[PDB]
Design an enzyme around this catalytic site. Structure first.
Site, short mmCIF file in Angstrom:
data_model
loop_
_atom_site.label_atom_id
_atom_site.label_comp_id
_atom_site.label_asym_id
_atom_site.label_seq_id
_atom_site.Cartn_x
_atom_site.Cartn_y
_atom_site.Cartn_z
N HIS A 288 -23.15 38.28 59.31
CA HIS A 288 -23.67 39.44 60.42
C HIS A 288 -23.63 40.81 59.40
CE1 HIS A 288 -22.18 36.26 63.06
NE2 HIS A 288 -21.25 36.14 62.13
N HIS B 77 -18.01 48.12 56.69
CA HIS B 77 -19.17 47.40 56.26
C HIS B 77 -20.13 48.29 56.95
CE1 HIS B 77 -17.71 46.79 60.40
NE2 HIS B 77 -18.76 46.90 60.76
N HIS C 67 -24.24 48.66 59.23
CA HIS C 67 -25.23 48.01 60.17
C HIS C 67 -26.49 48.83 59.53
CE1 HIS C 67 -22.29 46.67 63.01
NE2 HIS C 67 -21.72 47.49 62.58
N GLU D 7 -26.36 52.21 64.76
CA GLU D 7 -25.79 51.64 66.28
C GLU D 7 -25.51 52.83 66.91
OE1 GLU D 7 -22.50 48.97 65.26
OE2 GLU D 7 -24.14 47.55 65.82
N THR E 147 -18.92 46.70 68.35
CA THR E 147 -20.19 46.49 68.44
C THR E 147 -20.97 44.97 68.23
OG1 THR E 147 -20.84 47.18 66.20
CG2 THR E 147 -20.67 49.02 68.20
C1 4HO Z 1 -13.83 44.45 63.73
C2 4HO Z 1 -15.34 44.98 63.67
C3 4HO Z 1 -16.17 43.81 63.96
C4 4HO Z 1 -17.58 44.04 63.98
N1 4HO Z 1 -17.88 45.49 63.61
O1 4HO Z 1 -19.38 45.82 63.76
C5 4HO Z 1 -16.93 46.57 63.34
O2 4HO Z 1 -17.49 47.77 63.22
C6 4HO Z 1 -15.67 46.22 63.34
ZN ZN Z 2 -19.55 47.64 62.67
#
Ligand code: 4HO
Ligand code: ZN
Length: 257
Positions: free
Chosen positions: A61, A91, A93, A103, A195
């Site tokens: 993901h 991480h 997105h 997001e 999210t």
């Molecule tokens: C723990 C978790 C899982 C997915 N996402 O996007 C997050 O920002 C944090």
């Molecule tokens: Zn995230």
């Protein structure tokens, strides 16, 4: 299983995770005009000088840069937070095009990507017990725009070709997340959720007002990752963002005038 395609994307997640239609879901649109300044907020404290990165993982993901969170080392406190939250992973997105990817949105503006620095409340002992609580997480969200390169990002971008597909990981030691922060720590904050599934409502969101700039070549390299595993049809890891959710009975507070 869940993902970001037509048959398993955000509009489907509620069937496996009914909390998708809950009372404090994330992300949201930040209406800057109606986010009230809160003079009781403290400055945020980001203490990342002792952060210990371990590894980088393509989880199917996103890619997660994971930290050793077994000691008191990379912590977020102050701002809206009671107590101490420990960094576990970050991480991003991002989009298939520079015009989308974040997001959260700011007066409906989508940035090219969004960085999430995930932290758990140390009063709950570890991450798994913290996601059973409504104040178990704090996620520091930072917008990315395309312009000048971010030199502090480049070590991440260079390692991506070793984790192209789902389930791959690579050693990733000595990465300093201070190099991903903008100058200002002015922020908006509100109560919300993860999210992605499991969409748990644990999160005090702290979203910085100032974006960081990354180069078009840096974000292009994010878009070469794959959602699929090795030996499976190639599906580029792009558009791994959830759209804004209803604000419901929530207020977004600003740390700044
Ligand atoms: C723990 C978790 C899982 C997915 N996402 O996007 C997050 O920002 C944090
Ligand atoms: Zn995230």
């Amino acid at each position: 299983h869940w993902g970001y395609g037509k048959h398993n994307g955000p509009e489907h997640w509620h069937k496996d995770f009914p909390i998708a239609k809950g009372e404090r879901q994330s992300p949201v649109d930040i209406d800057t005009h109606t986010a009230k300044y809160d003079p009781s907020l403290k400055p945020l404290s980001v203490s990342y000088d002792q952060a210990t990165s371990l590894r980088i993982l393509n989880n199917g993901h996103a890619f997660n840069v994971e930290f050793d969170d077994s000691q008191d080392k990379a912590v977020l406190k102050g701002g809206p937070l009671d107590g101490t939250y420990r960094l576990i992973q970050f991480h991003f997105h991002w989009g298939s095009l520079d015009g989308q990817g974040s997001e959260h949105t700011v007066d409906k503006k989508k940035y090219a990507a969004e960085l999430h620095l995930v932290h758990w409340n140390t009063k709950y002992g570890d991450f798994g017990k913290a996601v059973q609580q409504p104040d178990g997480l704090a996620v520091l969200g930072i917008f990315l725009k395309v312009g000048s390169a971010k030199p502090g990002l480049q070590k991440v971008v260079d390692v991506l070709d070793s984790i192209k597909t789902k389930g791959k990981s690579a050693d990733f030691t000595n990465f300093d997340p201070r190099g991903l922060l903008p100058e200002s720590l002015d922020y908006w904050t509100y109560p919300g959720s993860l999210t992605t599934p499991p969409l748990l409502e644990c999160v005090t969101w702290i979203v910085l007002k100032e974006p960081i700039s990354v180069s078009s070549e840096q974000v292009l390299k994010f878009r070469k990752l794959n959602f699929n595993g090795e030996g499976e049809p190639e599906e580029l890891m792009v558009d791994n963002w959830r759209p804004a959710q209803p604000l419901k009975n929530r207020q977004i507070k600003a740390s700044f005038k």
